[PDB]
Amino acid sequence: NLDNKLDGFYIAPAFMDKLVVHITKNFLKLPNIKVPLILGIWGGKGQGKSFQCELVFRKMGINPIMMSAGELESGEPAKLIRQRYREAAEIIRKGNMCCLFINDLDNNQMVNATLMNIADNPTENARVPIIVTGNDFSTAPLIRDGRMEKFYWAPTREDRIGVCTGIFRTDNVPAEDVVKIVDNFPGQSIDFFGALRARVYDDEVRKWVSGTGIEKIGDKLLNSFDGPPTFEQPKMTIEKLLEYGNMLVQEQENVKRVQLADK
């Protein structure tokens, strides 16, 4: 029900209600319900699950306290959680909303255990909603049973079109156009479409290069007084898009071939 578009970007309104509400819930004292502190987000493969989070956070003006998984690998594993919690908490405990956004997973006995002890109370303290992302939250079990929420994000076709409109806002493309390609290219990531749009730019440069002297480029590009030759953004027309989309798919399908046949 709440407004899910943001700086030309789209947000899956199921994903939004889940996160927004998970968050605002942990700031309230609402009667006779145990509110889970941490919300673990899984699924939404190909779709920008982390990016959706970022989107939501900006939409509330939360500068989350980020963390990486590679950081929680390399003292660090336990400590850095407590400290990154406290950091967020001190933000919240000065004012304005904050949350600890822990991101990605695929040592662990501990990382769990620190969650469990931290889930049991604040501990001067503070109340900070943790958000986590992964693939599937395996062996969470004791804190799912206890005090955490798993959330499988099943994006719609609607969500894909939305995320996809995001990618092309810049190039003023019919809502129609976006619908045709997404439909035309099912089970492809958002990475696919980024790649597609980038492939159109690429080609233009390739034409420029090939055109205006491979040998005499570094100059026209550097030791010129008029600067680099400032490029005009290529019109992202539909037939362009389709041609490029199959092209990329053939290529994909081909790397799979050379991969499995070399292996």
User: Could you give the CA distance from residue 59 to residue 80 in angstroms, rounded to a whole number?
Assistant: 27
Annotated ligand binding at 44? The verdict is yes
* CATH code of residue 36: 3.40.50.300
State whether 110 and 161 are in the same domain.
no
State whether 96 and 198 are in the same domain.
no
Q: Which residue type, as a one-letter code, is found at position 204?
A: E
State whether 172 and 240 are in the same domain.
yes
Domain end among 155, 179, 201: 155
Check if the beta carbon of residue 134 is closer than 8 Å to that of residue 105. Answer: yes
Q: Give the residue from 34, 125, 39, 35 showing the smallest Cα distance to 88.
A: 125
State whether 56 and 172 are in the same domain.
no
User: Could you give the CA distance from residue 35 to residue 226 in angstroms, rounded to a whole number?
Assistant: 61
State whether 94 and 142 are in the same domain.
yes
Token digits for 4? 């899910």
Annotated ligand binding at 146? The verdict is no
Report strand pairing: 5-6 vs 9-10: antiparallel
Burial zone of 8 (CB within 10 Å; 0-12 exposed, 13-18 middle, 19+ buried): exposed
Question: Buried b vs exposed e over 189-216: b needs ≥16 C-beta within 10 Å?
Answer: ebebbebbbebbeeeeeeeeeeeeeeee
Q: In the 3-class helix/strand/coil scheme, how is 113-132 assigned residue by residue?
A: HHHHHHHHCCCCCCCCCEEE
C-alpha 171, offset from chain centre: 21
State whether 2 and 84 are in the same domain.
yes
Annotated ligand binding at 46? The verdict is yes
| Torsion, CA 49, CA 53, CA 54, CA 58, rounded to 10 | 150
What are the angstrom distances between the C-alpha of 188 and each of 57, 93, 241, 244, 252?
26, 42, 14, 14, 11
Estimate the share of the chain in helix, then strand, then coil, as percent rounded to the nearest 5.
55, 10, 35
State whether 77 and 161 are in the same domain.
no
Annotated ligand binding at 49? The verdict is yes
Structural domain span for residue 83: 1-155
CA terminus-to-terminus distance, the chain: 50
Domain end among 125, 155, 185: 155
The residue behind tokens 């941490």 is: 38
The method of structure determination was X-ray
Annotated ligand binding at 162? The verdict is no
Domain count, the chain: 2
Annotated ligand binding at 50? The verdict is yes
Annotated ligand binding at 227? The verdict is no
In sequence order, the 6+-apart residues with CB closer than 8 A to the CB of 137 are 40, 42, 105, 144, 150
User: Could you give the CA distance from residue 254 to residue 46 in angstroms, rounded to a whole number?
Assistant: 20
- DSSP label of 235: P
State whether 108 and 227 are in the same domain.
no
User: Could you give the CA distance from residue 95 to residue 89 in angstroms, rounded to a whole number?
Assistant: 9
Annotated ligand binding at 45? The verdict is yes
State whether 207 and 101 are in the same domain.
no
Domain end among 91, 122, 155: 155
What are the angstrom distances between the C-alpha of 228 and each of 72, 173, 187, 200, 210?
43, 28, 39, 19, 16
- Residue 144, classed as helix, strand or coil, is helix
In sequence order, the 6+-apart residues with CB closer than 8 A to the CB of 234 are 171, 200, 201, 204, 240
State whether 22 and 58 are in the same domain.
yes
